[model samples]
Target: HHHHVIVLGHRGYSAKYLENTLEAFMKAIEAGANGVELDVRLSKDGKVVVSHDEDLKRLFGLDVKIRDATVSELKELTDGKITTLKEVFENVSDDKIINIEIKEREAADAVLEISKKRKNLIFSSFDLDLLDEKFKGTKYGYLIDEENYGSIENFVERVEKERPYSLHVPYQAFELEYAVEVLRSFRKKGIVIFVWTLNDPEIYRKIRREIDGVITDEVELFVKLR
Candidate 1:
């Protein structure tokens, strides 16, 4: 097992507080998380807001889409619970790493603007085009899911072209020994691998040895495991 594995709070200790909320992030940091991961999207007025889904239906009872609504409208709907990417950076400590997942290409410019002056920040996206030429110098990761790239060879081939600072793979991708071998090959090429949303302790323990970091909802449990 690696002695220095990073444990990031998935959606900021989402198991306790509402996901992507400022409260959730603070709680994760207070619980001694190395960092926190959150999703970002653009508002109608071009402001960058933190939320996983395009719409608020999952978390808030509102059925409004984030891209279609103004920041003011979203705040009013969520009772000021929602926050911007800038607001989060301002509140969190400089030492704490923040992994910002771009939900759409439209949010890239705003995210890039905010992240330019910040430290301990990295942007991730499933859409490879979103992290294209404009995002060259900055730290960014490519998110992978089973349906998109089932085989590790396919994943490696794509990564070779993308040349991301890290690879954000789903936990299920690491369940097989072949996956671990692929990860090791990437590590040899200087690419870090971070597994996502792993809640089960036994599973976490098993895969923890093969990756650089773990993104999880159970911040306390991961902290203890480390």
Candidate 2:
């Protein structure tokens, strides 16, 4: 967000490998991405694990949720490719940014503990309560999308109340007439604004100079563009 605009691989070069795996994250770093954004959910055994888990059927032809399956069970299902959050932290270098999107309600537990010992960890969550309260003193972001954005006017109130370190905006948020104005104001106040899932550089170009960072699945292209 300084010196140069940040380019974070959404789910770590998700376009090239199984999303949120160690392989995809390493690929993104190898491709020269500044960092990565990955989703986290509590594995059935209560370990914080990397996965969209938002799907298992999509990868394993098994329709179980990540929270319903143990780590060993998931490993067996995926040939040991699935990994824990700690594994990613240990594997990735200290200088790289790791934006962790907390995916389940109250799954904030272990991640909060881990963040205590780490550096450059930005905790993002759709759960406003967790970001606002539990993640104090850390760079926590508020996530919004089409289904839950409410009205822009209402967002001003939310920002004042919660004071998130960043705002994770979906691409369609540009549809609001004054979206740019309201959003840019937040950035001006020192809140970083990162727009997401933009694989298309053309769409990214439209807001290239405006955003603090761009999150994309197309890591290599964005790395070149950044």
Candidate 3:
């Protein structure tokens, strides 16, 4: 089916809970989200932590870069709490899926350890090398960023090279003809197509008419609408 229902919770239920936190991801799964999207970064001590931003200032009001601090230090700073990739896997139930976005390319090695064991997880990154390595010999998927947005021929060429399970394009790029052109070429190859950050009900309805899935921040509202 072209219009399969896939509800991707952006950074979990981030609109209500702290984004990329274990609590947020649990809430998303509890709310019946098909998959929770999270951002992954590495601490100075080489532990892979889940967070949206490179720094803690925006989310925690502290001026500390995630990569600059050790995992123990970061955990203390986050109030004796820091969720690692292994920790998240242990907490998440089997019913839900995970989409982990890579922020630090080096952390891709850490991600591979978890991704290889988990069948329901997908790895995505703007960094092509990271995505390529992380998805090796796994069912994990990858998404190309908006920079690759271009003609259908070009899109196909990139996909052929990268061989991601899905193509994630920007919300504004979801035109009918473009979708048709790209989707037609990829669907035969079993490549799923998803659009990013679509919150508008009208656009959601329109894009939902043609795409396989959607990544959105307003999970509850979009779920109700869908």
Instruction: Score every model by TM-score.
Output: 0.94, 0.94, 0.89
Q: How many angstroms is residue 52 displaced in model 1 relative to the true structure, after the best TM-score fit?
A: 0.7
Candidate 2 lDDT over 100-149, as tens digits, reads: 99998657878888777889888998777777777888898888866565
As a TM-score, model 2 comes out at 0.94
TM-score of candidate 3 to 2 decimals:
0.89
Model 2 misplacement above 4 A:
1-3
Cα lDDT of model 1 by residue, 179-226, tens digit: 778888888999988988888999877777678888999999888877
In model 1, the worst 10-residue window by lDDT is 146-155
Which one is best on lDDT? Answer: 1
The Cα local distance difference test for each model comes to 0.86, 0.84, 0.76
Sort by TM-score, top down from the best: 1, 2, 3
- Comparing 2 with 3 on TM-score, the higher-scoring candidate is 2
Encode model 3's per-residue lDDT on 11-31: one tens digit a residue.
888789887888888887777
Question: How does model 2 fare in lDDT?
Answer: 0.84
Model 1 clashing residue pairs (backbone): none
| Candidate 1: Cα lDDT at 43 | 93
